[PDB]
Amino acid sequence: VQLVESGGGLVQPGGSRKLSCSASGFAFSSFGMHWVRQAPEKGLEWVAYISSGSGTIYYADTVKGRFTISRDDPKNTLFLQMTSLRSEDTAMYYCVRSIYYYGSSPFDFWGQGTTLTVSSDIVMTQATSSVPVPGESVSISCRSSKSLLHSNGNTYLYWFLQRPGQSPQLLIYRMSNLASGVPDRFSGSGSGTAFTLTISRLEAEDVGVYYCMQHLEYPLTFGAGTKLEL
Amino acid sequence: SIVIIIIMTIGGNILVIMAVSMEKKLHNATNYFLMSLAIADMLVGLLVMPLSLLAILYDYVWLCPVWISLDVLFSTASIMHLCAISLDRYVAVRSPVEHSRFNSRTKAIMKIAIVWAISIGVSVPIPVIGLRDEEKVFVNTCVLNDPNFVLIGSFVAFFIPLTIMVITYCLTIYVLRRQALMMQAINNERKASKVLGIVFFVFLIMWCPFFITNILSVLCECNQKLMEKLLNVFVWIGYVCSGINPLVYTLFNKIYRRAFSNYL
Amino acid sequence: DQLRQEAEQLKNQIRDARKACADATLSQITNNIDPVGRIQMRTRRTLRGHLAKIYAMHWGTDSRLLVSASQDGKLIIWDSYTTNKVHAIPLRSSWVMTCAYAPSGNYVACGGLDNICSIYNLKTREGNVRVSRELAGHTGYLSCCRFLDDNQIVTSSGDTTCALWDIETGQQTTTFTGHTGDVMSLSLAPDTRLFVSGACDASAKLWDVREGMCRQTFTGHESDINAICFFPNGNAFATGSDDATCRLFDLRADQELMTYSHDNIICGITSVSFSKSGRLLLAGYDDFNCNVWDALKADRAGVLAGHDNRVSCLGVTDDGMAVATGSWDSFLKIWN
Amino acid sequence: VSAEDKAAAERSKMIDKNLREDGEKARRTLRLLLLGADNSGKSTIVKGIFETKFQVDKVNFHMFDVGRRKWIQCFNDVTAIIFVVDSSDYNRLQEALNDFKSIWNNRWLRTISVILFLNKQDLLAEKVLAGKSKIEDYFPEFARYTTPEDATPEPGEDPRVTRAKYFIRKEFVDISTASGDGRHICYPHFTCAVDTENARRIFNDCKDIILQMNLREYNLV
Amino acid sequence: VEQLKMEANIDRIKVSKAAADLMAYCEAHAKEDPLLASENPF
Ligand SMILES: CC(C)CCC[C@@H](C)[C@H]1CC[C@H]2[C@@H]3CC=C4C[C@@H](O)CC[C@]4(C)[C@H]3CC[C@]12C
Ligand SMILES: CC(C)CCC[C@@H](C)[C@H]1CC[C@H]2[C@@H]3CC=C4C[C@@H](O)CC[C@]4(C)[C@H]3CC[C@]12C
Ligand SMILES: C[C@H]1CNCCc2ccc(Cl)cc21
Structure with a gap:
């Protein structure tokens, strides 16, 4: 791959x-x-x-x-x-x-x-520029303009992590599903228009910017980004 | 009195139509065409036969400009169905593997579309001309007088299918005779020839006289009174061979005989 | 010359022991139980895409995914709620007779007249489904296979033996012998400790997985046994045969309990399955339909008559809200 | 519906298209099953499961050789069955007749025709000319058998091998005529280890079978 | 002979007790069987 x-x-x-x-x-x-x-x-x-x-x-x-x-x-x-x-x-x-x-x-x-x-669009809102902070718990939140819960039971929210000099990496899809290769220190939850991301114990590799994404309708929209500074 | 033949035609068409849906276990490519032929025959019996009896009772008029068109349309459809069945039988008996590969619903749908498309071509101008020229449909009293239609549409309706059918019959008989030279494998190949001969001769006898009389009534004028007297009795023979085709093509497979015995 | 008399004496001892415990029958204690009544079920989904006879079918543990096999050489995974197809797996041989779905949802297995059981991996980084291992060692055709976990599988074959395999190494760890005819069907207990096998010798045996020894042997049918099912509590058998008879066996009374038959049924039985509570018994027949039986009364509660050929597959979901059937007309139907 | 459901529907439609594409190629090959006992010479008629392929006049055939009460159920859609009998071993002809009877009357094979090969004619002819073994020692009814007046022996053949060949062929045919009611036909043939025309006979018999099916389909028989 | 001897040494119970256990199991889980519109997923 x-x-x-x-x-x-x-x-x-x-x-x-x-x-x-x-x-x-x-x-x-x-x-x-x-x-x-x-x-x-x-x-x-x-x-x-x-x-x-x-x-x-x-x-x-x-x-x-x-x-x-x-x-x-x-x-x-x-x-x-x-x-x-x-x-x-x-x-x-x-x-x-x-x-x-x-x-x-x-x-x-x-x-x-x-x-x-x-030389109509769904607005995804994050509001924190930097969260100062090893071994401690950190919570990051996102908020949407319209509900992401569809009638079939699925909620379409995605989480990404970008380390310095690296490409974005998938952590959670559909708000509760941990991606392959991700350690079990990451978890996520929410309901309606409010969502949170939880890290049980921070390490030196958990420094970067976290992004929120929705997948209900095109166009796809991203959040502003939350920076975690250790 | 004569009204009985309409009842028998309707009953036979209904029996043929029903024996395909409820019975099931019937290949679409060869059994869906029989439903179309039965539907055409039933429409003939419902829209054509009851109206000519009224004229027979009255010996006058009242109708004509639309009846004539409907009659021509449905008769052409029936003849096209017979010719298509003959051609398909020949193709299914000479190159036997291919036909098996080709069989699908996309052949039945295509055949139905083509036959019904050809059927309506000859009936459209019948009310167009009649509604703009009363003399063309009323003489002295409902009969198509114009030679420009009688001597033109008749060949397409009858005389080309007859040639196709006779050539197909001869080729099929030759092919079946040749194959038997190579036991139940031999006995079954003669009953098919017998059935084919029966069907061909029934069609020829039932349909031939009317068109000959109709052509002679136009190009040989010959006492017109005798010609119209012959036409008054020949045209009903073409009507009669509309409840026979749904039968003679059906009551030879034991499945159809059992279904008819149990249903009726 | 001397051992035959001893064997006959032991058989007579077993027969005399069994008769002493027949103090009652099901038909007498159930006189105080009301009938289930008439049961109506209608087709909710129709699955199209197969071009040949369907021989095997098995549900997933999530009650949505379904796997089916046919003689066209392909294995299809279905989404039952939407009828969408999820995967299509070509087979190296078209003579397939059985299929199975792993309880974790990661693997699927199949086999047939090639005497090989093949295991496929459904979750790969490349996006394709690939073959993980081929299990060889039988001399006859493979008739049924069932998973115990991601690393253990049990198979039955027509060479009169059953086997327990180690998927990691591909080696056979235990061989089960004692039948005299071809083995048709397997059923695995809920506690994953015992399993049951039917055979063409009109007998049924209970096997111990951990030791590899036969514990009990049951008789009674007059012809080959075609299907075996396991009552939910782990203490009963349900078997079908080519003599148009179903029977219920108990592992603690060590004898037959109730017989399901009718004078108008003269065809074989192809599949047997239970409901969640065990009150209804479902069976497939060669009369082109499936019958619904009352397990405690040997009555007929209903019938499913939507197929145009033999019924070969039958299954029930873990939540009990659907029933799936498979036939030789290349169609699958979901009943509720 | 959600966008992911639309993409899933597109994927399912593509899967359906690929399934439909594969079916067209499979339908162009005719399938045959080969049955017979040991010493019959099955492996030479056209020279878990063994397979072979051959083509005659742009038509493909696929023949299967397994290795019977259970696996015979899965071969009920084949075009025809090929049966090979050794006609130069009188001790084992009753076994062949019993096997042929058990195959002809199988309830799953009621609509499949059988092509019958009576193999190794040269050994039979040599034994009959030698006179060291007689059919009458195993088949008493042969002493009262006479060659039919409609026989067509090959030129140069002594009129003592034709009697034996026709006796054996009659013994095999009489089973086929006792049941079937016209739903399937037997096609007897005499062959040997050196004959090469065997491919054409199968092609002709298959063409005849398909012709009979087509005749039945059009309500002519 | 050995297999019959092993099968002979089984501690058996009465048929009535086993049938009563079967009936009790069937009655206990009756409410959880959906085969015996807003809830049907199909
Ligand atoms: C036979 C001769 C004497 C009849 C003379 C009567 C006159 C009035 C004619 C005019 C039209 C005729 C009918 C038209 C044609 C047919 C069709 C045929 O299938 C039976 C007779 C039947 C139904 C005729 C009966 C006689 C009839 C009513
Ligand atoms: C009088 C007219 C309108 C009737 C129409 C006749 C139709 C049914 C005829 C005309 C041409 C024919 C086709 C000619 C060639 C082939 C190829 C062969 O491998 C399969 C059959 C097939 C495909 C034939 C089927 C029947 C056919 C479609
Ligand atoms: C008078 C009607 C009679 N019935 C059949 C249909 C038909 C076709 C062609 C022509 Cl010329 C005339 C007719």
Whole structure:
């Protein structure tokens, strides 16, 4: 399981550039793919989504008519075509793997990313800039504008952790499910529009920024981010 | 008196239609077409037969511009069904593996669509011309007078299917005779030829006279009184062979005989 | 010459011992119990996608996932609530006769005329389902397999033996011998300590897993035994045979209790299963339908008549809210 | 519904498409079952479960050889059954007849035709010419048997091997005529260890069987 | 011979007691059997 992104560089406003992603180590044709953008002082933003069979395609409201996403299964590569670039497009771009069926984990693996330099929605709210703090308990909360509880019994909230110099890593999906490879010190709970994350005992590897994400309707929205400083 | 033949036709069509749904265990590709033929025959019996008896009782008119069209439409549909059945039988008996591979509902649906699409083509202009020219449908009293339709649609309705059916019958008889030269495997291949001959000759006898008389009444004018007298009695023979086709194609498989015995 | 007389004497001793305890019958103590009445069940879901006869079916422990096998060479996992398909697993041989679902939900096993039991891994990082191990050692065809945990499995074959396997090493740890005919069906106790096997010699045996010895042997049927089920409390057998008869055996009275038969039934029995409380007994027949029996009265409470061919599969969920059947018409139905 | 349910529905639809695609290729192969006793020469007729494939006139066949009361149930959808008998061993002909009777009257095989091969004719001919062993020692009814007037012996054959061959073929056929009521037919054949035309006979018999099924389907018989 | 000898040494009980135990088990869990609209998942 490995995803490597390419492309990037310096461009002038009004130009165009094409990005690529090379996949290996898994059945690429059975997974759906996403592009996620992170600005230096804005956090995480979603861009587009392409289905495994090229059936459905979605775009963000700030990129429609300028961005095009394409897939090449026999070559196991992704492409994103960008035209009429603006100053707001300077940011880091990531590639994310997704698979959808009963009991799956749809945001399990993230790439490394490349840098590009130029020249109704559900609001997810976090409010704390830094929580100062080994061996102590820490609680982090999120709040949503609309309820995430669907009639089928599922609540669509996701948690991510970003260590310095590292890509985001999945911790909890659907508010109670611990991801594979995660130590049992992490737990999460909530109901309705209020959610919390609990860490039983902190270590030196638990320093970073935590993000909240919802998966009820497109577009996908992220929180502001909560920084834990040991 | 003559009304009995309508009752028998309706009963036979209902029996054929019912013997496919309730009985089940019937392949769609070959048994769904018989339902379509039975439905066509029932519509003939319901929309055509009761109206001509009224004219027979009155010897006058009252109708005509839409009856004629309905009669032509349904008769064309029945003939097309018979021709399709003959062609399918021949194809199923010469290259036997292929036919087995090809059988699916996408053939039955296609055949039904094609036959019903061809059926309606000849009946559309009948009210179009009649409603703009009274003389074309009323003479002296309801009868289609215009040669431009009698001498044109008749060939498509009857004379091409007859050639197709006779060629198909001859080829099928030859193929069945050749195969037997290679025991129950031999005895079963003669009953099929007997049944095919019976069906072909019944169709030929029941349908041939009317079109010959109708062509002679147009191109050979010949005392018209005798021709119309012959037409008054020949056209009912074409009506009669609408409750026979649902039977002669049915009561040879023991399953159908048992189903008819138990249901009726 | 001398051992035959001793064996006959021992058999007579066992027969005399069994008769002494028959102080009552089920048909007499149940005279104070009201009938269940008429039971109506209707099809709620229809599962399509198989192109051939279905031979095996097994539920998961979450009451939503279901696994089925057919002669087209593929193994399908179903989502019963939405009818969506979850996985499709090609098989290396199309002559499959049994399938099983691991209680942890991570593995599935199958086998048939190739004399091999194959185990598949459903949770991998690559996203594909792959074969984990092949278990060889039998000389006949494989007729039934059931999991005990992620590392232990019990199999029955047509070479008159049963076996206990170690999945980590692929080696057979205990062999169970004593039958004279092909072994058809297995049923594993709730406490995972004993199991029961039926065979073509018209007899049933109770086996001890921990020691590998036969404890009791039951007789009574006139032909081959096709299915065996386990009453929830762990003290009863339910067996079906080709002579159109079902029987109930008890492990403490060591004899038969009640017989389920009818004059209008002249076909074989293919599957037997119980409800949660054990009041209803479900059985499949060759008459293209499934019958519902009252376990305590040997009456008929209802019938399911939605299939167009032989019924080969039958199962009940752990929460008891659904019943699944499989037939040779390539269809699955969920009843409630 | 949620977006994840829509993606799951798309995946299920793709699975259905792939299942439908695989079925088309399977339907183009005809399946055969091979049964017979030891010394019959099963392995040479077309030269857990053994498999073989061959093609005649762009038609593919797949023949299975298992290794009988239980596993015979799963072969009730095959096109035809092939049975091989050694016709040059009189001591074991009753075993072959009993096996053929047990196969013909099986309740799961009531709609499957049987292609019957009577193998090793040369050894039978040599033994009959030698005169060191007589059929009358095992089949008393043979002394009263006469060759039918409609016989078609191969040219050059002595009129003492035809009598034995037709006696054996009659003994095998008489079982098939006692039951079946027309639902299936027997196709007797005489073969040997060196014959190569055996592939064509199966093709012709299968074509005839499919023709009979098609005739029954169209309400002609 | 040994198998019959081993099977002969079984401590048996009366049929009535076993049948009473079966009836008691059936009666005890009667309320939990959904086969014997807002709650049905199908
Ligand atoms: C036979 C001769 C003498 C009849 C003469 C009577 C005159 C009035 C004609 C006009 C139309 C005729 C009918 C039209 C055609 C048929 C169809 C045939 O299947 C039976 C006779 C029957 C039902 C005819 C009976 C006689 C009839 C009513
Ligand atoms: C008079 C007209 C309108 C009747 C229509 C006749 C139809 C039924 C005929 C015309 C052409 C025919 C096809 C010609 C060739 C093949 C290929 C063969 O491998 C399978 C059958 C199949 C597919 C035939 C089926 C029957 C067919 C579709
Ligand atoms: C008069 C009617 C009689 N019935 C059959 C239908 C039909 C078809 C063609 C023509 Cl010319 C005339 C008719």
